[PDB]
């Protein structure tokens, strides 16, 4: 089962499958927490987790691919029905998908599409060895975790706050992520709780935002996501390696995620995240649409 789709129909008439179910702002309140430079909307990372839940539903264990193409607005005391679309089986091995929401409750408002993509294979393990022995690794600089970042400080409430300590080897960020009291008696019914892996996302953020950082306006926003697997579902905290590609692009982020749990075994992993740093009035107009 899963707490945000509640039926998963295999189409009679062609190869494909259409799950749907229910974002309640009231059930889930801790989506509220995800507030980006002023405007509430729902964590990217969730799109990730729905179109891992689809990948189950289908039997494909991989998110080859996935684009983000409109945030999803919450409403503050409301609902969203949701829709993934599941498109037929190709000769490689890959099904197209879509996310989609609209308001709950008008049964002809137009659905919007937050995100897009193809299911597949898996991609090759990566080891977990960098979370057993010494942590952080040898090596290892601090991350001072308090340490204010404008962009998540000023805005974000207490699910969105999942990083208790990292540190950095060169380029890679090693981190312990964990939900907070609470939110953390649901990760059991989540794939990946989105505010577990967006705590990874937070990691990367302070380390790339702080001590030394040259000021910038705005946030990195995620549109991107490549190879995301998950092997183990229902994880509540872990530990993360987050590896910065070195950026060709000055107005963009990319790094990979793996993430171990609390015996060092793999849980997760995305072989690609890639995000455009964005303004307030950018996040603003994108939700409203």
């Known amino acids: 089962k899963h707490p945000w789709l509640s039926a998963a129909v295999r189409l009679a008439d062609r190869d494909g499958y259409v799950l749907s179910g229910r974002l309640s702002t009231v059930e889930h309140a801790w989506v509220l927490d995800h507030v980006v430079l002023g405007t509430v909307i729902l964590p990217g990372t969730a799109f990730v987790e729905l179109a891992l839940a689809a990948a189950d539903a289908?039997?494909?264990?991989?998110?080859?691919?996935?684009?983000?193409?409109?945030?999803?607005?919450?409403?503050?005391?409301?609902?969203?029905?949701?829709?993934?679309?599941?498109?037929?089986?190709?000769?490689?091995?890959?099904?197209?998908?879509?996310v989609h929401s609209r308001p709950d409750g008008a049964h002809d408002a137009p659905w919007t599409a937050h995100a897009r993509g193809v299911l597949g294979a898996a991609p090759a393990a990566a080891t977990t060895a960098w979370a057993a022995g010494a942590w952080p690794p040898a090596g290892?600089?601090?991350?001072?975790?308090?340490?204010?970042?404008?962009?998540?400080?000023?805005?974000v409430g207490p699910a969105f706050r999942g990083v208790t300590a990292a540190w950095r080897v060169g380029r890679?960020?090693?981190?312990?992520?964990?939900?907070?009291?609470?939110?953390?008696?649901?990760?059991?019914?989540?794939?990946?709780?989105?505010?577990?892996?967006?705590?990874?996302?937070?990691?990367?953020?302070?380390?790339?935002?702080?001590?030394?950082?040259?000021?910038?306006?705005?946030?990195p926003m995620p549109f991107a996501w490549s190879?995301?697997?998950?092997?183990?579902?229902?994880?509540?905290?872990?530990?993360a390696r987050v590896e910065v590609e070195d950026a060709s692009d000055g107005d963009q982020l990319a790094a990979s995620i793996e993430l171990a749990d609390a015996q060092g075994?793999?849980?997760?992993?995305?072989?690609?995240?890639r995000a455009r740093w964005a303004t307030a009035e950018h996040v603003r107009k994108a939700a409203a649409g």
């Open 172 to 219: 890679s960020i090693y981190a312990d992520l964990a939900l907070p009291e609470g939110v953390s008696e649901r990760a059991q019914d989540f794939g990946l709780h989105p505010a577990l892996l967006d705590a990874a996302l937070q990691a990367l953020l302070r380390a790339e935002l702080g001590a030394g950082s040259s000021p910038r306006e705005g946030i």
């Open 58 to 98: 289908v039997g494909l264990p991989s998110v080859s691919e996935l684009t983000i193409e409109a945030p999803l607005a919450l409403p503050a005391r409301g609902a969203v029905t949701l829709q993934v679309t599941v498109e037929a089986l190709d000769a490689t091995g890959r099904r197209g998908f879509a």
């Open 140 to 155: 290892a600089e601090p991350v001072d975790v308090t340490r204010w970042v404008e962009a998540l400080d000023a805005w």
């Open 265 to 273: 075994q793999p849980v997760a992993r995305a072989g690609t995240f």
């Open 227 to 239: 190879d995301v697997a998950l092997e183990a579902r229902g994880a509540a905290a872990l530990r």
